[PDB]
Symmetry: D3
Subunit: 175 residues, 6 copies
């Protein structure tokens, strides 16, 4: 059973989506879902001593402009295990390009951690934290010779619009 295809995008789209976590915060190993089987697979070991600053995964039943499931980053105090489902509230979106591809990523908080009850938009996140995430994506592939361009951060409304676009793109590609 491939979780990417089997799970709905969320219980109350786009206000609450499912995040299917692939990479826990603190990992230098970059995991992805095997397309065929839906098992966790090692994509690569990051070439530099950086760690994922957030729990990182995908939204089920989405497709994006870069030809992959739509990425989501969830701020967790204690990281989860790979292949864990988290009910997440989108609060913003990171706009970036990776080798000419649109590789934007939703930023979200868990609905069921009261610590984040008042985080509802991109302005609620400490600025240094947004910078640390952006810097990670700016440099994590530098030793692989890849250039990424960070364009900036969009707000919750923009994140939600993009989620709806990605849901539609999945329906068209696979429907």
């Amino acid at each position: 059973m491939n979780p990417f295809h089997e799970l709905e995008p969320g219980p109350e789209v786009p206000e609450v989506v499912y995040a299917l976590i692939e990479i826990p915060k603190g990992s230098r190993n970059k995991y992805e879902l095997d397309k065929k089987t839906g098992l966790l697979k090692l994509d690569r070991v990051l070439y530099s001593p950086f760690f994922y600053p957030v729990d990182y995964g995908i939204i089920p039943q989405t497709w994006y402009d870069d030809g992959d499931p739509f990425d989501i980053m969830v701020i967790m105090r204690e990281p989860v295990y790979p292949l864990t489902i988290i009910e997440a509230r989108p609060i913003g979106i990171m706009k970036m390009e990776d080798s000419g591809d649109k590789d934007w990523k939703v930023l979200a908080v868990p609905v069921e951690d009261p610590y984040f009850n008042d985080w509802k938009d991109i302005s609620d996140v400490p600025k240094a934290f947004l910078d640390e995430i952006a810097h990670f994506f700016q440099r994590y592939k530098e030793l692989q010779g890849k250039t990424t361009k960070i364009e900036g951060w969009g707000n919750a409304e923009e994140a939600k619009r993009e989620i709806l676009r990605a849901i539609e793109m999945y329906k068209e590609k696979f429907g």
Copy 2:
């Protein structure tokens, strides 16, 4: 596949049951199985800085009075990963109510760790450890405004009887 439905309750019930672990000891995140997919799902982050004192999960193909699979707590020296199957020997049962529901939980040791070879009943467990488990369940939802009531501990014999009842309740509902 959904492990809860596919696995037998145990290889030698009720002396040895399977525990399907959801939450490793040391976790502040509370995980459950997604009913539709069988994937691990975050239920909540505990509101207080407490950690699960035991590896926590369910016995497959059981059903209990609180409308859930029968809970089991396994004492592991090194915690396992979520969705790991452990062969476990029941040694007692924690009697508690949660918001008016009978929410009893089996206490068990792993068959394949020789450290626990001589643990066969509730009297073999250090008292302080039983107290720490009871205290966790007494207080872990306090900030959510929920009230739990700890009745006490039953012995291995009582635990095994409850397991049999839960196995029967499952067959009846499904």
Copy 3:
């Protein structure tokens, strides 16, 4: 040497104080400084499966109404090692009594983590996090039969006033 006596209270009191950390966030072991040697010493293992929600220590060259150095709690994203000095900005104070003693504790953020640059007062802290800290101190000695009473939280201004008093109390006693 005994760090408690040798270090100044801070580089810019009371806006920036030194926190000498005894217990990293995540610890169930409660450490204290040995008075005679200044070495880290195990005070006790918490009776319940709770972990310190903050990096916990003392402000050097302070003394408080409960006959101990003034306690300080520092919010660290990655916990430090015991006996590490942190430059900390006080942002509030937890008011509590422990067995009849005024056992108030400063809440502070590290000056050198830009994540907390905009945390300057108690109102900047998520409410759930204040609750989790208060709940820990309310219940962490329950199984030892001790009673703690949480009064509430004071703001940064009140915290800084108490720090000044504690600095004065130290000079007076020593």
Copy 4:
């Protein structure tokens, strides 16, 4: 779906194989795949305070002389999670017997960690590391009264031959 039966042995066998990891480096718990449901199962807790010195698993769709899937050991700098697939390059083979059975194990490195780009054969591995692996297997069941016999190490060519033999054995047994 049982991953052992569902996954191919690898993408470019025998030069690159899939390792399906059961036990991460550092574990004292010995896990195995429940060959009924494909779930991870605790086989035992090692009787001694030893930890697995490598990420340990199996090559899918293989069968070996000892009546189990072919074992594979992958050298990872950061351990992976159980049930993770790693693309691995075989560089040697540990020859050992366990209770009279031929219990040989492939030694491999991850293709996607550049740290190991120049490890291509058994001679590239520090001698002390080979010794630590062999010692683990020599002694890890001593308190269980089990007897193992370490014969030595074979090179990459020998490992690859054995992988092909194990792939053929699976086909004959299950095909």
Copy 5:
């Protein structure tokens, strides 16, 4: 300040002694106190993938037949940091010889963990645990070519007698 020389052996010898921890449970690095400065020093990395099964250290102001401070092993549920003092109750003693030297080690529990309130003698410890400790010391230096002989376990009374002997030996050597 050298903690080995500055701290008393304990607050209520020999019923309660100080354990000065050098190596936390779970470490493959073997630490010791630098004789000159009293700082922690790496002695060696264990040649095999074994971890210390107990928090390991010394009793201050003791000297033993093997020309070192008297060793103590403390059973802790959560390991402490190196150079931490633990008030410990001796419950037994491991009798062993290392290359002809008497290298006996006290086994103790922390006074301030109620989990161990009823552990007062060697018979209170699960047998498998005693075996795992003995096996560790039997094999941890095998790849270094060293032979150790495990002679057995003595009870709490014997442990206490040896503590008193070691305290006297320190007074004579340094007094």
Copy 6:
């Protein structure tokens, strides 16, 4: 006692030096020795989600052109604790500038880990590992607006010469 002033540079300089570790591998917290009390102090939290790729510290009784003790990086398989002394063999040197200052750093391996017995010079280190260390230092202060310049790597002979120069500089400054 301040360990920086109290400890000798090493037991057989410059072939074997003491590394006094301040920051264990894997730390995002940057620690330094309070050169007043000798206690560990938090210098900063790195602004980016990078971790120290090596155990990092200083050689006691040295002084360098940048007005601080001579830096040393030790490759450890299992990280040590802060303020631990490691006996280390220099195998190379990283040449870099930080804010116009000569901020060179010794690269070394532990003498007492047999894994590294055959690492004796910079050419023995996997190229990808040298790159990951250099990249860390190139970028770890980028969000602080600081500029570093990585010049390259020198061999063991050059490292040893520099160690002797730093020992002499300390003597002239403090002796």
